[model samples]
Target: VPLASRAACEALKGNGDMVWPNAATVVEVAAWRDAAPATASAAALPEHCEVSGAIAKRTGIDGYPYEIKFRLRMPAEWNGRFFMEGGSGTNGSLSAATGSIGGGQIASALSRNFATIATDGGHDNAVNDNPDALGTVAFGLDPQARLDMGYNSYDQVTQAGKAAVARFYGRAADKSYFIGCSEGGREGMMLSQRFPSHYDGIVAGAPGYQLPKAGISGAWTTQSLAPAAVGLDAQGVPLINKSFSDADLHLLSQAILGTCDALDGLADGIVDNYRACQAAFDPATAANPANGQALQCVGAKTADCLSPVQVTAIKRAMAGPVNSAGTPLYNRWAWDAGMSGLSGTTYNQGWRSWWLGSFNSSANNAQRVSGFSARSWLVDFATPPEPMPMTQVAARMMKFDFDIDPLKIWATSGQFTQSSMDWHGATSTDLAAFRDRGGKMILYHGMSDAAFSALDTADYYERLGAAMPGAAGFARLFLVPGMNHCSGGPGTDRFDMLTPLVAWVERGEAPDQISAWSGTPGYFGVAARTRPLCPYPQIARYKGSGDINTEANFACAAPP
Candidate 1:
């Protein structure tokens, strides 16, 4: 066991004694003791060696200036485990290495006795520094920062964290795990692809692995939806609020639910079987079910139906971005009911905010949520002149040259075109190397994720399955039904994915059906419901008859 007695832990603590080797100058290590049966709060981490530090590295492989600010918390009562937590958007700030999965806050990986670490990917630019939040690409001008954000941070942190574990614990950790969602998920994929030996288990949630691709896909959405933009901003980007009204979106959602809600053997408002739902809900026309007749869109629009124009828009968006010859730009979107701009209901809930912002009752202006995403690419991600006008930036995004390498087109001087592909792409299919060495990975994405399409993730997994025939033995993909981005959107999203991943890595136990729940007391409400998130291709179906709200009544079924 890579552990020391409580007495050894106490003996190692002293500011002058230097808990961490070669890092005491700027890095501070403070070891403390906590009583058993710990009380909890946000900053109240249990008994642990709290190492907070900053590192300044002279640029070489990454180029230009770079530095990393990191924090590692080591628990007192060791479990011989180490965890590297993931970060969020742009990652300018360090996230507490909680290692919580599935949006559950019940306990952290630290509480479970894992020494965890987190890093603020690279730069430290404030959002107000740019006002436009284009600081990501602005920070990207430094090649090393881009590399750090892309993959270097993971490699650096992993090495440093493991060393810190050894220096503090007197031996290396027995097992290492990584759990992250969203951009953090991208980092998780980066580790598995580039530094496979670092982790024993990895849980990648809603990974935007094709970050630039997904970032550019948003431009496609803006261009497509803007054709219907009720009004264009002075900068020339369409005001998405005008693209589709709440009433119109709700009508389209109704048509979808009427068609696809029962495909999962229960009309529980969630479309559990996405494949079956796709065939059932045809956006081309509100068609007759089975008879194959097109439903008419005549007369005034009502709550129950869609207009021809609305139908066309929905089809175009779900069909995804296409060139003049209809070449898919990224991948088609999953036809989930979350596209509806409805709120606070089981079926059409938690969606309006994604596309349309808080309703402007006075001037009748509808704020669009996707506009924020557009700014990230056009103003920040895309390599426009420092002082480029918003109008020119908007125009540039409208005609974004997808054929040219985005690194060249989007960044100023960071040679990240190939670097991004090598690191952030996460496309390496030969996980056999990872599996051969006894490593396990879990890749999951919400079916209703608006940022990166789950379809793309499924395609990536299918490619992996082709490369390694026994891929399922070490890696598996789970599609969370009805959840958005990483969490929310009328789905059961509160479950500890880390628990299952650790069990798989440490105990040689494969998760057949991982159970998940929705709603925490103060968070989303009481436990709204519980469900089992099935692995890829298999979906949870009603097992004849039982409590409709409970997971026990459902079984994972191969699609018909």
Candidate 2:
């Protein structure tokens, strides 16, 4: 498609001519030029018209001004496709509408000539004056802001974005796709569940679909690992990482690999048969040594094995949170090779970074349980939007009572009519509406994701299958073994699901497996490795005669 006239683009700014169902005001419009190529292999960015605007501007009950600010980029060479990028964390800032997909290094939709859009989920973090919490989630105090952040923003932005695309291109996009990871991943799931007809395809990676419950798991992990703390930090926060040294974690991961690595007919570091691995590996000491080497230390704590306290803590943490009645509050985590982080890499700390943080620094120690998880649980996930002293955040998590606090996530209070789950969750298994509308979804989760368990996604996929017998026809889940969170770890964390998703949505081609590669030299001490990420309930087993490092040697098969 030829580029729209520059006059048409310039006219959008402050003209009040471009309109949508929601009140939208285009503040700026600029003709962007492609930057000079930096390298011979670098793909030149497409020249496009960039539009910035605010949608549904309003004042919230908390006296805070809120508006879903968005940026839309319409490439000069239109591919007739719309790409709505998902938001991350408590989105309060608009990310570039580059349409990043996969591990974020692959080609973006904008580079491929697809029109793209991104939004700041309805609140500006810069205006927050809350001294007790970070600005990103301070908007939780506002009911409408919470609603907008949860699911409304996507709906409104999609409407406005598509309308603008039509206005500029003289026609609506032929196909639409949404791609995101983490919170953005959750947004993608929300779109498929709540606005089934909005997008033709979606790619959700490591989605916190049940974020409130995941917050509970985070608190549980903190409390469980407290006993293993070696000392208090300068701020009096417990050093949770003292429970497991890098060597201890490495030892534990090696034990897990020994028992399950060859289950898929390959002794490679990646644990492709995660389901079978769960049954084969046990964290606690076994009575019969032949079953497996005991992870529990028999004597004083050493680098060789985890201390008894550390072992119990990890067991409880991985088992997830439970109420007094033995009801599971969240899904249990899987035992994978990535749990110890990539063996030799300076990066990808994996579970160590997520579960315990750093042993020496209080700020680093609070990165997960005490920082992101605690703040989110108090300010965002809590039904009434509880804000507390930042100093007490760690202590509050340490004192989180599973029986009582677990209910708070689902409890509604005055002004907050909907519980956190009602607002933030995207756990519905019934996707018939999305499927019947010809919408395709690709759900992938890292087996070793520290924030959200891969098992939870698998459980959801199984339920989706049961709810809709032909679920795989429209929805498929890919489990990346050894991957940590959205990327890194020993697994082949790099691959583009968007390419396959587009094909599935536009050309009726189903992806049996996606080729993935790990370029981290730390994993297995190799320069690189390649593998096939198989669909749910299927694993990439070795064909037994080709190079193990190449994906071609593996075949997706049902577990024996």
Best by TM-score: 2
- Model 2 over residues 238-303: C-alpha lDDT tens digits? 778776777677777888887788888778777888888888887675322234446677877655
lDDT of 2: 0.81
Best by lDDT: 2
Error of 1 at 275 (Å): 0.9
lDDT of 1 by residue, 1-560 (tens): 23444444444444544344335225644455463354554334467766666665455342334567777777877788889888766677776665555465567787777888888876665522343334344555455666677787777778777877886777899999988888888888878778889999998998877776664565565555655556656655556555566665665555666688788878865788898887767865665333344533566655445556656655676677665556665788887755552344433435544443333321112212234454444433444323243335545556665555254333444344534444356767767768989999988888877778888899989998898897888988889877777877656766778888888998888888888776521222433578888989888898888876688998877976
| lDDT (CA) per prediction | 0.66, 0.81
Alpha-carbon shift of residue 280 in model 1 (angstroms) = 2.6
Overall local distance difference test of candidate 1 = 0.66
Off by over 4 Å in 1: 1-25, 28-44, 57-66, 127-133, 234-236, 287-296, 300-303, 341-372, 378-395, 399-419, 520-527
- Clash statistics: count for each candidate: 1, 0
Instruction: After the best TM-score superposition of candidate 2, give how far the Cα of residue 516 lies from its true spot, in angstroms.
Output: 0.5
List TM-scores for all candidates, in order.
Answer: 0.85, 0.95
